[PDB]
Symmetry: D2
């Protein structure tokens, strides 16, 4: 039910081999590790979770943009990019979190479908 896709606005390409960590907000308001992986050749990260595991709650998707840029020899501004949202069962069932990266900027959107 959750896919992350990352694109590079400088090169006009997927952002490949970018680390992504997903956390779930715990009862005590801390961020608990939930899923992680690295984007593929298409800039996509599939298979993070299952429907059974992905219960309603607040999630954070942290994208390691800084390591991405440094690997390409580029000095970036941000430490990482964070996307924090609530999963709601009343809405559609599949979530794509997309991010478009530049050294000093990023954009993100949600594509939420059934």
């Amino acid at each position: 039910p959750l896919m992350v896709k990352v694109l590079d606005a400088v090169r006009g390409s997927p952002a490949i081999n970018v680390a992504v960590h997903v956390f779930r907000k715990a009862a005590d308001d801390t961020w608990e590790p939930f899923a992680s992986g690295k984007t593929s050749e298409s800039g996509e990260l599939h298979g993070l979770t299952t429907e059974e595991e992905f219960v309603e709650g607040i999630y954070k998707v942290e994208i390691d943009t800084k390591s991405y840029w440094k690997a390409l020899g580029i000095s970036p501004f941000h430490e990482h990019a964070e996307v924090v949202f609530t999963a709601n069962d009343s809405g559609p069932r599949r979530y794509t979190i997309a991010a478009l990266l530049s050294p000093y900027s990023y954009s993100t959107t949600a594509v939420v479908t059934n």
Copy 2:
């Protein structure tokens, strides 16, 4: 070699049934019709052209954003969104033109891969 994908930043969804027209710049500097279609349920428009037809040159992708918004009952700012670029055989071979729409704003990127 050419795909167009359109997303809606207000609803968090693909932008479905959006008209898209592609033109090629002619020798006389006019814009000649090249391909067209409507985005699918995934927000994607496939099958616009073939490798044989998609020669180097300047192309314009016009996205009918105004009709899209009006169909949803929303007053938009722009008449359309235009994306104008050069296809270059020295670069990778497959082009995805992606656009993210809001009533008063849009973003576009190119994903160019082999």
Copy 3:
């Protein structure tokens, strides 16, 4: 009543010396030159027009992104960024057209205010 601002997402800076051409759709359906200028050191282009001159119409703001990137020695994807909109059709408004540039991407937004 019309201002254009351009920022550079690679440098984290204003986009300086960006050429901008504004056209207005004529009776015969052609794009008539209306005004032009260059962004300043702040990334802003002021003084394009006047409230008398900026009548109702369909306007095109062409931001010469290719020229900008090439002048920096970069080979970018797009020829330019065009922003096309109807203006002043419910009386005079002030318009800021903002753009944020990367070599293979751009975004644009409008800020529309009623004086």
Copy 4:
């Protein structure tokens, strides 16, 4: 040396009355409150800090987008938008953090200048 500007991509306007909280990473690795404020009618938030106070460090600028959209009666996707960056590590700089909001999307950029 720190300014936050927020625009609304739905309305085509500044995003007014947006709450912003700035944190600085402490020695123990926690996010310490540093400053906070609200955007004005221009969408701008000035006066967060001073050059004395804005020392080197890792800063987080939290823009309370959910609160903004809810106050407008809209149900948005994100909780907030966070912008996290190292500041002043090669001496004092001025930073503008700009954001452009839609209910299911946002973008952010930095303008960094050396006075």
